[PDB]
């Protein structure tokens, strides 16, 4: 078969056009005025990597947990077009503050049967995912997991249940009503919008065994959201992302080195050394590790009949903490920078295994009920 590559990955692409530069200045100004932040500062929250100390944290406070999807984290902003004050416009924007204008998308207002009324000053936190259906059909979906503002009112200072509560009633409910009767008009939407499937902090097992294997998109871990804390812009020490070791991948520069024998010539059919290199300076690479390859994989690699050396590969750590080939990355000019590699490995060193996480669940459950007393 073909060599595993980035083309195997179902990659969600934002179904919109980049907003013009003059337009984003207005939006950033408009958003900052609404939230009370700095205009060029991303108002979204960022999670911290799940560490060992976070087992105790889950025992002390009420938590929700959801599936962390393979997709794009972006904020959805319902507003009016910066150039056309009478035109309802929806924007998606990521942590790099890149605004995408999405057309033909529409969020109904409750009890308005005219269909002319629309929401403004509404800001959601969610994930853009690509659901795969049989027959090679694709469906873009936006999974809402938090609400920063709804109809001019800032909910950041409220708790999670209230934030998600206002979204469900004011936005999700009318859209559901609308979709039931306007199915034709719904199918033109660039994407569908829904509240994310959530569980109580101790319902981890249910996620692993029932929810995650039934999703129509990919998964790369869990998100733990505290229900006792306000929404925090930037790094939130109470928002935890967990991820198995096998999903903490690194891009390396692969380089093959063949044993130069003293007698005769080189046997190229024999397994060489697989050197993994880290990118530092300009075109300056440094040795970092050897990729472990067994005989069966080496034959498989040769059977690909593609160049192996001098290209970017994504690798993962196995149970023996050996770096293993995952796929080629043709979409990368260079391997990860040493600073990036260090960060990933730190998340692994302070990591918690899936077994330890599960075996700590019942204690987390009983403490949750001792608080409900």
């Amino acid at each position: 078969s073909m060599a595993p590559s980035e083309k195997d990955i179902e990659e969600v692409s934002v179904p919109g056009v980049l907003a013009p530069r003059d337009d984003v200045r207005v939006l950033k100004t408009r958003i900052a005025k609404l939230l009370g932040t700095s205009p060029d500062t991303f108002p979204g929250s960022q999670p911290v990597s799940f560490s060992k100390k976070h087992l105790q944290a889950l025992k002390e406070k009420n938590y929700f947990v959801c599936e962390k999807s393979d997709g794009i984290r972006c904020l959805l902003y319902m507003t009016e077009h910066p150039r056309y004050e009478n035109r309802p416009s929806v924007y998606l924007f990521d942590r790099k503050m890149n605004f995408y204008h999405v057309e033909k998308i529409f969020y109904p207002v409750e009890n308005d049967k005219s269909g002319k009324k629309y929401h403004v000053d509404t800001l959601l936190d969610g994930e853009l995912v690509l659901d795969i259906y049989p027959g090679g059909k694709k469906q873009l979906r936006y999974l809402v997991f938090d609400c920063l503002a709804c109809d001019g009112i800032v909910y950041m200072s409220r708790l999670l249940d209230k934030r998600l509560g206002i979204f469900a009633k004011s936005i999700q409910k009318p859209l559901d009503e609308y979709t039931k009767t306007h199915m034709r008009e719904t199918a033109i939407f660039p994407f569908l919008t829904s509240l994310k499937k959530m569980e109580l902090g101790h319902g981890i097992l249910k996620l692993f065994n029932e929810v995650i294997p039934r999703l129509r998109h990919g998964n790369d871990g869990l998100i733990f959201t505290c229900t006792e804390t306000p929404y925090v812009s930037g790094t939130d020490q109470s928002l935890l992302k967990w991820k198995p070791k096998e999903m903490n991948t690194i891009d390396f520069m692969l380089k093959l080195e063949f044993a130069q024998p003293e007698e005769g010539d080189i046997d190229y059919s024999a397994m060489p050394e697989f050197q993994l290199g880290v990118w530092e300076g300009r075109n300056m690479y440094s040795f970092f590790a050897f990729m472990y390859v067994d005989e069966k994989e080496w034959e498989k690699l040769k059977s690909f009949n593609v160049p192996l050396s001098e290209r970017i590969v994504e690798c993962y750590l196995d149970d023996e903490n050996r770096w293993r080939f995952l796929r080629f990355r043709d979409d990368k000019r260079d391997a990860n920078h040493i600073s990036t590699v260090k960060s990933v490995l730190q998340s692994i060193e302070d990591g918690v295994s899936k077994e330890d996480l599960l075996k700590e669940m019942p204690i987390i459950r009983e403490a949750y009920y001792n608080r409900k007393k």
Partner: peptide
């Protein structure tokens, strides 16, 4: 005011 709450 509305509130979100799953189980279990």
């Amino acid at each position: 005011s509305p509130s979100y709450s799953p189980t279990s």
